[PDB]
Design a protein around this nucleic acid. Structure first.
Ligand SMILES: Nc1nc2c(ncn2[C@@H]2O[C@H](COP(=O)(O)OP(=O)(O)O)[C@@H](OP(=O)(O)OP(=O)(O)O)[C@H]2O)c(=O)[nH]1
Ligand SMILES: [Mg+2]
Ligand SMILES: [Zn+2]
Ligand SMILES: [Zn+2]
Lengths: 69, 1159
DNA sequence: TCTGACGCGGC
DNA sequence: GCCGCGTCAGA
């Protein structure tokens, strides 16, 4: 991706990458890969970047997720 | 915490070696000849090192799961995994202690300094040439006395017993053991207390430091001589068999076998009570064998095998380019990598690349297996491999799904800059030829002449996402070194646009009016109108102001048909003015930069892809061709040649009479030939560039449409000099010396040349080809040295908070400004506020300069400003974000965790190869080498005079001699003429001798700022003349590493004038700064060192050892027992740990934030 | 080739 | 206090 859309919410281009990696790992550990949705849709790591671009997930909320796991 | 955060190096005691060794080797036997099995006490013996097979005894009697840790009584071999053999170590007992080769030949040898005696005398004692008295006795002979054998006999007869004079290693070890550090240090300091170090005392300084280091370590001094030597594990030195029924044997094994047998022979001789001379010979041979084993050839000719190649020492393996530190630690050959030929791949996107199907299948074969198992097509790994082998049709679709969103890395053999490695998304394509986007090629600096690229695939989720975020081709648009975009069209794409943009005075459809771009396109499709024809088009669209206000632009503007066609490609918010021009290659780059600065990177990438598509389509329609007729010879060339020949004949007639000197005649002939050649070249340009046609109403000159002129004018390819040679003349040809040959070539390539003329031209081309190949190594070596000096530098804090910076003014060369002050200060924050002559402050301090802000300085005409710099940065071992200011690659303030030093080192190195004369001067400036007879600077301010013996030791009265009577002068040569008057008021640090400036003198006398300004002016002046563009900040960052060492004038708690690190001085000053009171913490003066000298002076031993001189660094570190925290990017890479920069710092900061929420 | 550094031997 | 000879170490 251009990462330019993701940069508006996130700053430095490094915190965004770390947050995306953590979100992707959490999604993979969530059992999301039933194998009926992976073929029809893009990989989880891109999905985390898409969620950051929407801004629905919220960078602050993602840090709260780590404590839960 | 289960993690080792520190690494330390210390000397090894004999007890420690015994603890390390699992077994003792008495006989040198490697393997049974009849059967390839371990010898009972051989170096490959299974009992000490371990079992060859996992959980199997050598006899094989114990081969069951019931016994795993059991040890067979029949054989010494234990039951365990064979991997233990690699980590298992062994020791060899020595009958006579052997002095370590490294310490004795340290150069400076540690043993010689400790004994305070010459190295040659110690070597003579070791060889048994001389006798040294171990015990002083009541006899007058000193303990440190060398006695000749007849002298030794006489001393024994006169005094008999009461004194000992042993010889060889044992005597040296005894002398080391019987030494009192406390007694020696106090007496040595007392000699230091009476300080007379003009000559004799300077040597004594090293001994005190060495004694103090030994006392702090607590390591025994006698440990340097080794009583026992450990044996390296067999796996590190394998004797595995190979095809042809032969076994490869390591060089170390032969040395070990020789040493063991020599030791056995020595023990047998001692047991037999054989003659002393034979025993001495055996002892000397054993010592030589030990020296050869540690490092052969250090003090003697190296021993060689039947091949005659010198054997490889253990020290040799760890050092050198083929050495373990740089060969395997940084070589790290990796799997999942592919090398293939590169194709133009024009249809591909800027972020898309073409990958062969077979290579993709091999690289993603494990991923394909996982998908097949998930699919249920194959229930077993073996079944999946068998189906993959047959290339089943279903496999290709699965591979396409797996690689649909997976990034790949493309790299080239010469990675001069980070831009060379980039990440693209692979799309399966037929053929074995890799396809890459044409625009990305310029950054790669590679061409489709058979060049080969290597592709790497990231397995980790973080790595694959991280590469896409920062390693993607779209992410990199501007050069890291300079703001100018690297994605601009290079060759044909520019030419087609230039051809379409051109206008024709008379064309069909001229004066036609088109309401919209679609109407003009329909007219072109009809083809009734001419593309070069002039038409009026009404255009209404939004425009973005510098302030960012958007205004509507409407009206009727006359435009060429081609410009109207190009109008559709331009995005909204961009004025039609940029398209309304000849659209030369320089114009295209400016348009791309304007789009990126305001529109953004994504809009710029889309515009570049549209321009690339348009240029290829239009260029083919143009069908431009190159022909012999296209090049035109000048009509008046023959007359000019005849006139030049007549002038040469007149000069020859003058010389024959003897009226003119030969040298003057030669110079005149060369000048005449050069002038004639220049005139011929000037004439050729006008005819090709200018075409005269009889248009209606008369005949007028119009710009030529010749293909060669368009290519030269377009600037896509070629240059004026090539056009001059093809339609002009070779003229003067430089010989290997470079002096112009008096005869010149009037021949041209189109007309061809005579055999003699071709032979004269051959030398220059050959010399240039020889120069190009040799220069490649120097540029790489210089870049490596720069990377070593600035490798650890990084940004850790947003603001240092220092208000100290540097003064910036336009660098006028005295003939032109050359560099505008605004361009020099662009992207740089201001250290202090700027006050106008009117007295109204214009800019506040700590404000980053901007292009909009830059206009005010020229408008206010302020020629001088003060801006922050890395040298002025107050952070310890770090760079604040503010001091760097604009990153200059993303048009934003530099983000934290970015390695400025590595980029700065690489950017200076890459441009050097293109420039020839040149690289050596830059290298001398970086090394801070001082020019010979540079000049003389006098610190005291006083009247300058001469008259002190007139013996080449002329001195002047630097002291005033009026208020106080004193003489402050030093001897100087009378050979050079004086630069000072007989009577004058001499100033401190004023030049007294004409000549090159000395870099060391400026820092101590002119201060840091003057030296920094001089270095920047010299480096920029050298780079700009060649036309290479380098940011000033990149040069300054390397300079900051150059000054980390200062001399401490006052040692409140520290040492004296001995060089110390600035970081150590500041922390020590801080510790005593408020620890009790003031305590006179320190007084220091900055010093200048060479980049290599600075890198070797680095605190971390591992970083210094890897760069070079590994043996010397290791020998110094072991005695000091230095404990080193990695504290570096390089240290982490060796341990395979995340570097403290970029993503790694961010992960740590996020982890620190996570801890608080749970806390 | 060379550069220098470091030497360290003559006086 | 120094000339002038030398080692090493990288290219
Ligand atoms: N030809 C061309 N296309 C570009 C260029 N820049 C962007 N695109 C297209 O725009 C789409 C933008 O992809 P994203 O990464 O999701 O958006 P972003 O660029 O804003 O991050 C891409 O779609 P995609 O998922 O890659 O495939 P598609 O949707 O284009 O088929 C890409 O094809 C360019 O310079 N040239
Ligand atoms: Mg090539
Ligand atoms: Zn056994
Ligand atoms: Zn700073």
């Amino acid at each position: 991706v251009t990462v330019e859309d993701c940069l508006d919410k996130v700053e430095t281009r490094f915190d965004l990458v770390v947050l995306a990696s953590m979100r992707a790992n959490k999604i993979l550990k969530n059992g999301y890969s039933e194998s009926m949705e992976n073929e029809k849709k893009e990989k989880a790591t891109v999905v985390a970047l898409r969620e950051i671009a929407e801004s629905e997930i919220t960078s602050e909320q993602i840090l709260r997720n780590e404590i839960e796991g | 915490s289960k993690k080792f955060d520190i690494i330390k190096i210390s000397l090894a005691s004999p007890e420690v070696i015994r603890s390390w060794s699992h077994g003792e080797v008495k006989k040198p036997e490697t393997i049974n000849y009849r059967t390839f099995k371990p010898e009972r006490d051989g170096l490959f013996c299974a009992k000490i090192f371990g079992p060859i097979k996992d959980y199997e005894c050598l006899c094989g009697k114990y081969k069951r799961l019931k016994h795993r840790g059991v040890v067979c009584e029949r054989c010494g071999v234990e039951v365990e995994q064979a991997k233990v053999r690699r980590e298992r170590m062994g020791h060899i007992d020595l009958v006579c202690p052997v002095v370590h080769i490294w310490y004795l030949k340290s150069l400076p040898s540690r043993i010689g300094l400790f004994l305070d005696m010459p190295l040659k005398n110690v070597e003579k004692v070791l060889y048994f040439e001389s006798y040294i008295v171990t015990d002083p006795g009541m006899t007058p002979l000193e303990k440190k006395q060398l006695l000749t054998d007849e002298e030794y006999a006489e001393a024994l007869e006169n005094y008999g017993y009461e004194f000992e004079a042993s010889m060889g290693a044992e005597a040296i070890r005894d002398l080391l053991a019987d030494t009192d550090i406390e007694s020696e240090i106090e007496l040595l300091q007392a000699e230091c207390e009476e300080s007379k170090s003009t000559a004799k005392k300077e040597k004594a300084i090293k001994r005190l430091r060495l004694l103090e280091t030994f006392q702090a370590s607590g390591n025994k001094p006698e440990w340097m001589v080794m009583t026992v030597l450990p044996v390296l594990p067999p796996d590190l030195r394998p004797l595995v068999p190979i095809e042809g029924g032969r076994f490869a044997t390591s060089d170390l094994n032969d040395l070990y076998r020789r040493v063991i047998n020599r030791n056995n022979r020595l023990k047998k001789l001692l047991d037999l009570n054989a003659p002393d001379i034979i025993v001495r010979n055996e002892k000397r041979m054993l010592q030589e064998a030990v020296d050869a084993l540690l490092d052969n050839g250090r003090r003697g000719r190296a021993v060689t095998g039947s091949n005659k190649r010198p054997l490889k020492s253990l020290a040799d393996m760890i050092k050198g380019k083929q050495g373990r530190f740089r060969q395997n630690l940084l070589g790290k050959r990796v799997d999942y990598s592919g090398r293939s030929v590169i194709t133009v791949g024009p249809s591909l996107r800027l972020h898309e690349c073409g990958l062969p199907k077979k290579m993709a299948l091999e690289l993603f074969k494990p991923f394909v297996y996982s998908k097949l198992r998930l699919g249920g097509h194959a229930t077993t790994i073996k079944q999946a491999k068998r189906m993959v082998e047959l290339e089943e049709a279903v496999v290709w679709d699965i591979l396409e799904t797996v690689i649909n969103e997976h990034p790949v890395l493309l790299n080239r053999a010469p990675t001069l800059h980070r831009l060379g490695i980039q990440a693209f998304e692979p799309r399966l394509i037929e053929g074995k030829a890799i396809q890459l986007h044409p625009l990305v090629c310029a950054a790669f600096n590679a061409d489709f002449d058979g060049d080969q690229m290597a592709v790497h695939v990231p397995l980790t989720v973080e790595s694959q996402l991280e590469a896409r975020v920062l390693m993607m081709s779209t992410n990199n648009i501007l050069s890291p070194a300079s703001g100018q975009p690297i994605i601009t069209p290079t060759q044909d794409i520019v030419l087609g646009l230039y051809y379409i943009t051109r206008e024709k005075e008379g064309a069909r459809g001229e004066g036609k009016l088109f309401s919209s771009y679609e109407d003009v396109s329909r007219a072109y499709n009809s083809g009734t109108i001419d593309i070069h024809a002039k038409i009026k088009l009404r255009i209404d669209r939004q425009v973005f102001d510098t302030k960012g206000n958007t205004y509507n632009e409407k009206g009727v503007v006359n435009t060429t048909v081609g410009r109207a066609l190009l109008l559709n490609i331009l995005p909204e918010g961009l004025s039609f003015s940029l398209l309304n021009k000849v659209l030369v290659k320089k114009e295209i780059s400016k348009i791309i930069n304007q789009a990126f600065r305001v529109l953004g990177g994504k809009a710029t990438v889309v515009l570049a892809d549209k321009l690339m598509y348009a240029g290829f389509k239009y260029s083919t329609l143009s069908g431009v061709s190159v022909g012999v007729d296209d090049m035109t010879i000048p009509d008046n060339k023959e007359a000019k040649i005849e006139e030049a020949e007549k002038e040469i004949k007149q000069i020859t007639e003058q010389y024959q009479s003897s009226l003119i000197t030969e040298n003057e005649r030669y110079n005149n002939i060369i000048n005449i030939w050069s002038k004639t050649s220049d005139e011929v070249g000037a004439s050729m340009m006008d005819a090709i560039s200018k075409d005269t046609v009889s248009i209606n109403g008369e005949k007028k000159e119009i710009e030529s449409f010749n293909s060669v002129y368009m290519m030269a004018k377009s600037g896509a390819r070629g240059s004026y000099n090539q056009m001059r040679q093809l339609a002009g003349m070779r003229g003067l040809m430089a010989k290997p010396d470079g002096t112009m040959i008096e005869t010149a070539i009037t021949a041209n390539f189109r007309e061809g040349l005579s055999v003699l003329q071709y032979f004269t031209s051959t030398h220059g081309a050959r010399k240039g080809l020889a120069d190009t190949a040799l220069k490649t190594a120097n540029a790489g070596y210089l870049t490596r040295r720069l990377v070593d000096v600035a490798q650890d530098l990084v940004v850790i804090e947003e603001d240092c908070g220092t208000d100290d910076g540097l003064m910036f003014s336009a660098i006028v060369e005295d003939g032109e400004v050359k560099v505008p002050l605004v361009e020099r200060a662009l992207g740089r924050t201001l250290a202090a506020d700027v006050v106008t002559e009117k007295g109204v402050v214009l800019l506040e301090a700590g404000t980053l300069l901007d292009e909009n802000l830059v206009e005010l300085l020229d408008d206010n005409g302020i020629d001088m400003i003060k801006v922050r710099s890395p040298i002025t940065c107050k952070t310890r071992r770090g760079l604040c974000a503010k001091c760097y200011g604009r990153d200059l690659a993303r048009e934003r303030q530099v983000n934290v965790g970015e390695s400025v030093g590595v980029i700065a080192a690489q950017s200076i190195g890459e441009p050097g190869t293109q420039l020839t004369m040149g690289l050596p001067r830059v290298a001398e400036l970086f090394e801070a080498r001082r020019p010979k007879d540079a000049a003389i600077l006098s610190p005291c301010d006083g009247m300058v005079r001469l008259g002190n013996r007139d013996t080449k030791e002329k001195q002047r009265i630097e002291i005033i001699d009026k208020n106080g009577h004193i003489v402050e002068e030093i001897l100087l040569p009378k050979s050079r003429h004086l630069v000072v008057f007989d009577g004058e008021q001499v100033s401190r640090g004023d030049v007294l001798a004409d000549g090159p400036t000395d870099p060391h003198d400026l820092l101590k006398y002119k201060g840091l700022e003057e030296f920094a300004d001089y270095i920047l002016i010299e480096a920029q002046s050298v780079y700009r003349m060649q036309g290479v563009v380098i940011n000033d900040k990149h040069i300054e960052t390397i300079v900051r590493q150059m000054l980390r060492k200062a001399v401490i004038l006052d040692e409140g708690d520290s040492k004296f004038v001995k060089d110390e690190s600035i970081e150590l001085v500041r922390i020590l000053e801080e510790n005593d700064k408020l620890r009790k009171q003031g305590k006179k913490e320190v007084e220091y003066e900055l010093v200048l060192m060479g980049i290599t000298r600075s890198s070797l002076s680095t605190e971390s031993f591992l970083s210094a050892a890897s760069f070079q001189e590994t043996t010397r660094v290791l020998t110094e570190a072991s005695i000091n027992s230095q404990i080193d925290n990695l504290r570096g990017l390089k240290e982490n890479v060796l341990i395979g740990r995340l570097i403290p920069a970029g993503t790694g710092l961010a992960v740590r900061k996020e982890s620190a934030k996570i801890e608080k929420m749970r806390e």
